Design a protein around this ligand. Structure first.
Ligand SMILES: N[C@@H](CC(=O)O)C(=O)O
Ligand SMILES: N[C@@H](CC(=O)O)C(=O)O
Ligand SMILES: N[C@@H](CC(=O)O)C(=O)O
Ligand SMILES: N[C@@H](CC(=O)O)C(=O)O
Lengths: 319, 330, 319, 330
């Protein structure tokens, strides 16, 4: 018998954890020599960008690489910027078909700063990826000693190391002394339980986001309609409500080939049916607890399958 | 000596507080439907605490709030300040945080101005509106409420108009001052105030809307992965005075949005970096060199709040350094 | 065919929802005539008390009554004071063997007050008890349009209608328009998956709680030891830490027949092993995310099975 | 003209900030082990911002904090006020909220007094202590910090000593002012203060500990279902000066605890109702008739904080009406 440690692959994309997006994956790994106590780590550099410039091409690269490399490794850690980690995490949650752990991690302070968070965050992300109990929970985010599901996780504060929270349904488990006590798992369908298959796609449907506020301009929504966008997500006020002129434009869009999802600029809670807006009349879809950027992720993937608003609403009710 | 109650004026604007549906249990309803009289008569205890007069200013959902209603309200409060002891504004919850900050910067009346709404319509089981209205009147009637700026009173809490925001789509407890906390809590019709806002408000600002017929055009663009530049270009093509960016993280911009706004700022469009992230400041001295591009950092002002201050800044100046000073003081 | 509504039993115990503990169950039910749209409701008055005077005898009555009456009804709602609802809920979570919904509800404002919360809270508690998806999730608390598990739920604010929160792991689902979208279920073992069986017990082991703070007196802990308590839970400072003189007394207690659990006065997070206290040396048990009052519930039930600290720690790791 | 840095004195008391373990990754450690010099030298940037002098007052876990250390610290700060520009107190996190409020009521020095600790030991990977100490020194050096009472600086946040509390057992972000919010946030070594505490602190209180050798004996009892009266009776039998009840909900007491404390209050023991509930006030005019029993309602003071004010109240008075007035003003 020989004691064996799991093989973990780090897929590096950039971020302040490498600051954004300057230091290579080898350098990050070598800065945390205690990783050798818990895993055999191999690093690959996918891209080296600020996540404020994350895009559809990188999402598709990452999903295809994890799906292709699933059988070569025991788990994955993705180093990423914090700004759009919540978007990438949910894209991968819906398109990764590997049910081995896939864990995303970043840092709110650069590697050079006093009390930098990145080293311990990376250690705990590898702990999570190495834990057999992490499998079959979907794509995870590990930040500030917490395991968060890719669907609900969001950046709640501009600078706090403790910014990442699952604001509607809470975390899956807490990490202490290199161990996780998992008390929850996401009930929405993820990974191999979704129909989304991006293995042959080179691009995704065009989906844009418009913001609502007092005296809102309809010019952004008209610009997306004039460009023939596939979908528009509204960052509505309150329970997904729309300023009158935005409502007029989106009502046109939904009857003229553009899928419309009502989400909310409000940071917690669902955008529901059965409140002030008759979604069925207008052909709109209610986003539930998906915030605008997350609702975009699912609307792009829905539009790979269907343009029918009723079928899109059912997708928004299952994933 | 005889006890006299304060005179409180209710300026009604609509909202779910004035909403109705056909069932106490079904969620479906129409906002901004019931008049101010019906609201007042649903709270018979109000006569214990004030002499209430109701005026219907408009009756709309606050999803359709607009600059004209803002100007009407500021001018009415500043005109009528000497006729009453305090004001309550019944309003929708969806943009209450915007109206409250606009009034906090433009009201010159030293008397309490309190905004209130309801997350459940007037027809619903356990409707929140009646007690919210009672507590708003308590707050407007309390002499300790004066000189604290425009207030929002929701769920037994007195919140400053600058920091207060709607945090949850459905919860009666939605309104929170997420960066600096509430000013006071209300129990049994009494307030223990432990805080007051330090940023300049009301008669300490230079903003005077008494003779304005309209406000500068300021739009908001969202940032996210693969963000389109088409919204930003549409506001620039229309000659907008200002654009507020709902940035990712600490006010960061997707590169194609950054490019459009950098070009606009060079032509004289005012550009404020705010954040889609619901708490925390958009700072200077992070990843964007504001001075180089002619941008302004919003600090703790979220995108819709930063729009309010940017519109008022543009009544005074187009210079980015002067607008940043405004964003550091109000 | 005939459309049939579920049979729901309301077991009334008191509370402000009946204000505390003055109005009878019939009166509460008749104040919400819309209950007839969703259930056939029958009410029984178990006791009529302020939950600040909740006690072991009422817990045992309730567990035996639900276990006995399980086959007569489709679901249970328990009307209760808010002050110790979190304790009763977790006791029932560990001792109820009915896997039909068991839902606890209260009110923060009395029935007579402006904008009283009780009516809609009771409506939503019956919605929850009538929903087939509520089964097999353990004992639930329904407050402020939210379904909360009995283990994690706690009262977070002295007066707020929104006081009840599952502060470590979040809620199970949100209620809108008489429907629940459940996204979570508790992983700790509950109800028919626990060994605790109170069917023949007339009393529970004596377990008391001591508080830690600067310059803490050891007199409370000595008083419980001198009375021969079966167990003591410490409301420790920080990560379950003990003031020196309290530590001295509890170290004695644990070697002299008294089970000692370290919990925390801190409102969120676990009291862990492997920090400053060598639990194994002293024979102490770490409470994890169980706050002092919840740790008391599980320590009483553990002491029905075992007095061995290692077996008590395993119970604290599974339930 | 030449730039001069402020003189800041670090009074070290121990804590996890001074803790050590034998591994950077294992959780096991010992508190209050490393001396103040080693802490200062772990933050080489401190010379950019202050002239730092360290004094080791004690080296203990704050789980073993006590009245003697409180009196030492208050007397030392009040004696040494003219020798320095500001103070930082390195301390354990577990009872930092208690020490901070005691100093907030007894320090008469008008200069900044800032408390700081660390949730991870000095030996741990990504230890929080170094940047926390840097930010504490920033806060103590900032002239805008003065006259705000005793402060706690943790996780880039400036918190008032009255409202601040430890909310989480393990998280670096644990310290929050859960009722009224923080005073300011720290970014790039700068603070934007937007709040100051209204309750009277420091030179505005009557509490003078300059000649005290000890403090009144005040104990804390917990309430829960089937609560034993044995803890309350043990403090009464020992002749305690005061007892604080960690009540259920809005300061309610299990009947047998209520009975013991009602009898004690009649003999002259001071009794404060607080709450085990982590946010919100323990109010008057709820289910307990305080006036009838001779009890005092703690308001937003949690049990350990209410103990601090009760000990100091008992240095001035034993009258329950005067103690309630103290609980309404400080
Ligand atoms: N802008 C950086 C921020 C971070 O990683 O903390 C990024 O998202 O790449
Ligand atoms: N849409 C409504 C929502 C509410 O008031 O709660 C409004 O803002 O007018
Ligand atoms: N003291 C009451 C409080 C409430 O129910 O809100 C009780 O627990 O019975
Ligand atoms: N027990 C330690 C915990 C810490 O400082 O974080 C102390 O309070 O001294």
């Amino acid at each position: 018998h020989h004691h064996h440690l799991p093989n973990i692959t780090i897929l590096a994309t950039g971020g302040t954890i490498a600051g954004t997006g300057k230091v290579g994956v080898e350098n990050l790994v070598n800065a945390v020599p205690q990783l050798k106590d818990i895993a055999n780590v191999k690093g690959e550099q996918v891209v080296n960008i600020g996540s404020q410039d994350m895009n559809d091409n990188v999402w598709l690269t990452l999903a295809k690489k994890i799906n292709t490399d699933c059988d070569k490794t025991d788990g994955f850690v993705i180093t990423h910027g914090t700004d759009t980690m919540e978007e990438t995490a949910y894209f991968l949650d819906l398109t990764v078909k590997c049910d081995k752990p896939v864990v995303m991690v970043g840092a709110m302070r650069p590697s050079t700063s006093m009390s930098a968070d990145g080293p311990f965050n990376l250690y705990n992300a590898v702990v999570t990826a190495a834990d057999k109990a992490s499998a079959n929970r979907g794509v995870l985010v590990v930040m500030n000693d917490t395991v968060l599901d890719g669907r609900d996780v969001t950046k709640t504060n501009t600078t706090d190391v403790a910014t990442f929270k699952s604001v509607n349904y809470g975390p899956l488990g807490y990490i202490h002394n290199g161990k996780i006590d998992y008390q929850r798992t996401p009930a929405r369908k993820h990974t191999s339980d979704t129909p989304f298959d991006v293995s042959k796609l080179n691009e995704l449907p065009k989906v844009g986001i418009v913001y609502n506020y007092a005296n809102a301009s309809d010019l952004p929504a008209k610009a997306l309609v004039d460009a023939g966008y596939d979908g528009i997500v509204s960052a509505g006020v309150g329970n997904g409500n729309l300023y009158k002129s935005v409502f007029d434009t989106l009502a046109t869009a939904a009857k003229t080939g553009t899928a419309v999802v009502r989400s909310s600029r409000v940071p917690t809670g669902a955008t529901t049916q059965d409140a002030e807006v008759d979604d069925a009349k207008y052909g709109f879809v209610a986003s539930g607890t998906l915030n605008p950027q997350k609702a975009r992720v699912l609307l792009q993937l829905a539009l790979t399958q269907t343009k029918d608003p009723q079928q899109i609403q059912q997708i928004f009710n299952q994933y």
